[PDB]
Structures are given as structure tokens and as C-alpha cells.
Amino acid sequence: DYQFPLPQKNSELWIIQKKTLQDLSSGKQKLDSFQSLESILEILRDSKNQNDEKYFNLKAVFEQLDKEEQTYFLEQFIPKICQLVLKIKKKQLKNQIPKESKIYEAAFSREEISYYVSCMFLCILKDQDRKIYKDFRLIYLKDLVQQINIRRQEKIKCFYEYLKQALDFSEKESKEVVIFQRINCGQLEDYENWVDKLKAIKLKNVQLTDDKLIEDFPGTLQVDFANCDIGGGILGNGLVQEEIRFCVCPEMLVSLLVFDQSMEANEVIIMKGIKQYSDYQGYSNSFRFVKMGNSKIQKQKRNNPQTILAIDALCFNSSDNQFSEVNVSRELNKSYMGFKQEDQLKTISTGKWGCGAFLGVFDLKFAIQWIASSRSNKKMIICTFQDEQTTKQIQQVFDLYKQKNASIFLKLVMDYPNSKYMEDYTLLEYLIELGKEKA
Numbered sequence: 001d002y003q004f005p006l007p008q009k010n011s012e013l014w015i016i017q018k019k020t021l022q023d024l025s026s027g028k029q030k031l032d033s034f035q036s037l038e039s040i041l042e043i044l045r046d047s048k049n050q051n052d053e054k055y056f057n058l059k060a061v062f063e064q065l066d067k068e069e070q071t072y073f074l075e076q077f078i079p080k081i082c083q084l085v086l087k088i089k090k091k092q093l094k095n096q097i098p099k100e101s102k103i104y105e106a107a108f109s110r111e112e113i114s115y116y117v118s119c120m121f122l123c124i125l126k127d128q129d130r131k132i133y134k135d136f137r138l139i140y141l142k143d144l145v146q147q148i149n150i151r152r153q154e155k156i157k158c159f160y161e162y163l164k165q166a167l168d169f170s171e172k173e174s175k176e177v178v179i180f181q182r183i184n185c186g187q188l189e190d191y192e193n194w195v196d197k198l199k200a201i202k203l204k205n206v207q208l209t210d211d212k213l214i215e216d217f218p219g220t221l222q223v224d225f226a227n228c229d230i231g232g233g234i235l236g237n238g239l240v241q242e243e244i245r246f247c248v249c250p251e252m253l254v255s256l257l258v259f260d261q262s263m264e265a266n267e268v269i270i271m272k273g274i275k276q277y278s279d280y281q282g283y284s285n286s287f288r289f290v291k292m293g294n295s296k297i298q299k300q301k302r303n304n305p306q307t308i309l310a311i312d313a314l315c316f317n318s319s320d321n322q323f324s325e326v327n328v329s330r331e332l333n334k335s336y337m338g339f340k341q342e343d344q345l346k347t348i349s350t351g352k353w354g355c356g357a358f359l360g361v362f363d364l365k366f367a368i369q370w371i372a373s374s375r376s377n378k379k380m381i382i383c384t385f386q387d388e389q390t391t392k393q394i395q396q397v398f399d400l401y402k403q404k405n406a407s408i409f410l411k412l413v414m415d416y417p418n419s420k421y422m423e424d425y426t427l428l429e430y431l432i433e434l435g436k437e438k439a
Ligand SMILES: Nc1ncnc2c1ncn2[C@@H]1O[C@H](COP(=O)(O)OP(=O)(O)OC[C@H]2O[C@H](O)[C@H](O)[C@@H]2O)[C@@H](O)[C@H]1O
Pocket: 212, 213, 214, 215, 225, 226, 227, 228, 231, 232, 233, 238, 239, 240, 241, 242, 243, 313, 350, 351, 352, 353, 354, 355, 356, 357, 358, 359, 360, 383, 384, 385
């Protein structure tokens, strides 16, 4: 059972940090330049030596601010997040692996979350014995590759926006509860077990969207396409589906502090109470922070909490047989164990799960997710991410197989690779051909 150390755990270093934090917070010490801020960060990191690449990306963000916000940043924001850190009472955070069919729940007030993200912003979250850090130090550091520095800068913009919002929390918002759950879902079911269980299951409703994203569907169980280490590359270079979600919803960062151990095959993570603080455009290299406006939709994203399911798909290489009984049952288990959580959210918002960085074939991952949402007795919204061809194929498959037997469907899918259709047809195209023939 691991306890992630907070700054007070190191009693000696804390004595040093606390005084600096107090000086800044009280105005006793006032930052007159970004260079004075670097000196502060160095003290807080217990560093005696630095170069001018150590804070390069933070400086780049600072230098994009106008004169007035630059002054605000040095004279108000930094002092104010120092004061947030000074409100922390805990000395460590428990990282517990739940027993079979049990849950480890870690609950926080919305303001407490902002204390920890402030710690990340000031680079003071580290386990020195393990030589592990859970803060923004790498994001601040200059990389050789320009595109990587831009990614890191845009992350900083999102986190900065979130912290400015947190500093303005009303009493009511500050006290709201955010919940992280690591859920052990019990015994995995093997392929033949699945084949048998599905005999009683009919395929349920699917809605397709080609132009909206998962986070555009409030009041659903929204899927995070997770790494088995929750958060993936958020504290480094990563900027695909999971990392972008953490960027626009930085409260999710606290999951890093309580779920150190990789998710097992029969575990899933649930996050509740999560709000969205930034908007964005682009993806990966083209990702850019966008300040949220005051449209009804944007206000709702900022003000209405959502519940997120984090499930890690298999990370495939190009020669892996994704249609193996072993690999299909793995994904059926993972998706079903996740989808069946929070049974009051009768609709799943998902998409190309495991089919980007993890190299999954979406035809198959759609089928697996459909079987899983169907067995959970839930509806599914599938985001195709501007893939018109796939949208049309899935629509036709849905129309042909809706309400049909899920076990029969599963077996049909599993026969694809060795069928006479494999060379000239994709899985979806195969299903369409077969389904039409049945007619
Ligand atoms: N907000 C979104 N909403 C709906 N669909 C989306 C969204 N963002 C991306 N997609 C689509 O989903 C696909 C899969 O996204 P990935 O992030 O590549 O998911 P995955 O293949 O499961 O890779 C998981 C890995 O990447 C992350 O670093 C994560 O931490 C893990 O290590 C993308 O290629 C894209 O088509």
C-alpha cells in the first residue's frame, strides 16, 4: 500500500518551502520579474543549479500575456496559489489497490483539488525515494523539438486558466465533492463464457455523430481512452484523447496522486464531479487552448459536473492478431466491466477507443463496444471523429443488426479473419454483405 508524499511529509524541506510560500502569499516578498519567479521555483524544488531552459515553456506562456496580466501573474496569481498550497493539511495521499469486487474511493472538495494542482504548478510534488515527480517540471522544461514545446505551452495555458477559475470559487462551488474510484470488477470471463452469456442479449441502440466529440454529450457516461497508468502522457508530451481531457478538465490530475499502480485487466476507473474549464481546437501538434465563452453550452460545460469512465484498451503492434479469442475477450471484459458501472447513466459516450495511439482496428472495437453496451443494457453514442466513410458503414451495420442476437453477432465477427471476405472486405463491409444477403 503506497502513500504518495505531499510536501509536509519531508519535514525539513517543508520548513524551507513554507517560509517562501508565506513570504509570497503575504506580500512580504514581491516578484518583480519572471526571473524572480524562477528563483522561487528553484528554492521550492531544492535546486541550487539551473540553466535558462529549465522554465522555458512557462516563460513562453508568461510572455504571451499582455502587460496587465503579466503583472497580475507575478503580483497576484503566484501569491494566491501559494496561499492555496498553505491550506493543505494532509501529509500524504493513499494509493490503494482494492480487493476483488471492491472499490477504492478517494473523495475531495473542489477547492482541495485546486490545492494539489497548485502544488503541481509550483513543482513541489515528488517522491524522492522513488525518484518520481507528479508535477509540471517536464512541461516547463525546453525540448529539442519545437512542436513539443508548443504542446507543453498549451497545456500550461489550460492549467493556468483552471487555477484562475479555482481562485474565484464561491463558497458553494469550493465545497462540492469530486470523487475518484478505482473499481475491481471481479472475475474475468473467458471467450466461451462470453459466447454463452450473450445468448440472452439483444443488440441495443447506437447513435452516430461525425462532428461532435465525447465531451459534447453531458449526462452520459463519458469514456476516457486511458493508458493503464491513468493520465497517460499528461505530465509530458502526450496530447491525444486522454491528455486533452485532462487539459480541459484539470481536476482529473488528482487521479495521478491516488492511482499510482497500473490498472489491472479487471479494473476500471471512475471520476465523478468533473467540470470543464478550458475549450480547445486541434489535436496533438495542432492542439490549442481556447478560452471558454459565455454561450449556454460553454456555461454548462463550466458549471455542470460529469462522470467519466477511464478504460485502457490493449496497446497493439501492427502484427498482433486483434481478432484472437484471447484479445477479443480481454476487450469485451474491459469495456463491459466499465460500461456497466454507474447504472443510472443509461447512455455511454464513446468512439474510436484504442484505435489511435493503440493501433486498434475500429471496425472490431465498434463491435466489441456494442456487445458490451448491449449486455450492460445501455445505449451508445459513437463519435467517428470526422470519418464519413466509417459513419456510413456503422450506420448500415446498426440498421442491419439492431435487436439481433449478440452471441450470433459475436461469432459472425470472429469468423471474419478466416472468411473468403477477408482480403477484399473490411469487417464492417463483411457484416453489411452478410446482413444484406439475409434478405
Ligand atoms: N474528444 C474526442 N471525442 C471523441 N473521439 C475522439 C476524441 N479525441 C480523439 N478521438 C478519436 O479517438 C481516437 C483514439 O484516441 P487515442 O487517444 O489515440 O486513444 P487510444 O488509441 O486508446 O490510445 C491510448 C493512449 O493514448 C493516450 O496517450 C492514452 O494515455 C493512452 O496511452 C483518435 O484517433 C480519434 O479518432
